[PDB]
């Protein structure tokens, strides 16, 4: 099972600009690492995946409550 | 048929290191825009996908001959 040569990056450029409300995130998901700026993805329920800056407190507290629940 | 909110992005990190033979390249494909370092993908034939510096001639030689045959 040879792997891939050097594939893309699946990396965020920029991030939204308004909070998901805990009722619109289902799920998440993080960046890669290759890229020397990886960052939080949300997954919602009206749309895909959304990078969120890791910066922002409600962005590292919503990520500790999906770890919980 | 809305689309996603902000989705990451497949933006190329860094390129392999040795010119993919004309005999490993049958397709190629370009990253997104987003990201302001996008890059040209060679698709091989035992591998996957392949990052490579379009300041690199041969890589615009080798798109130039994938527009051509």
Redesign the interface.
């Given at each position: 099972a040879?792997m891939?040569?050097?594939?893309?990056?699946?990396?965020?450029?920029?991030?939204?600009a308004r909070k998901?409300p805990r009722n619109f995130v289902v799920d998440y998901y993080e960046?890669?690492s290759?890229?020397?700026q990886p960052?939080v993805?949300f997954q919602?329920k009206?749309?895909?995946?959304?990078?969120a800056d890791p910066s922002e407190s409600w962005v590292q507290e919503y990520v500790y409550d999906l770890e919980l629940n």
């Open positions: 040879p891939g040569s050097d594939p893309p990056t699946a990396c965020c450029f920029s991030y939204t998901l960046t890669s290759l890229c020397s960052a993805v919602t009206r749309s895909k995946q959304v990078c």
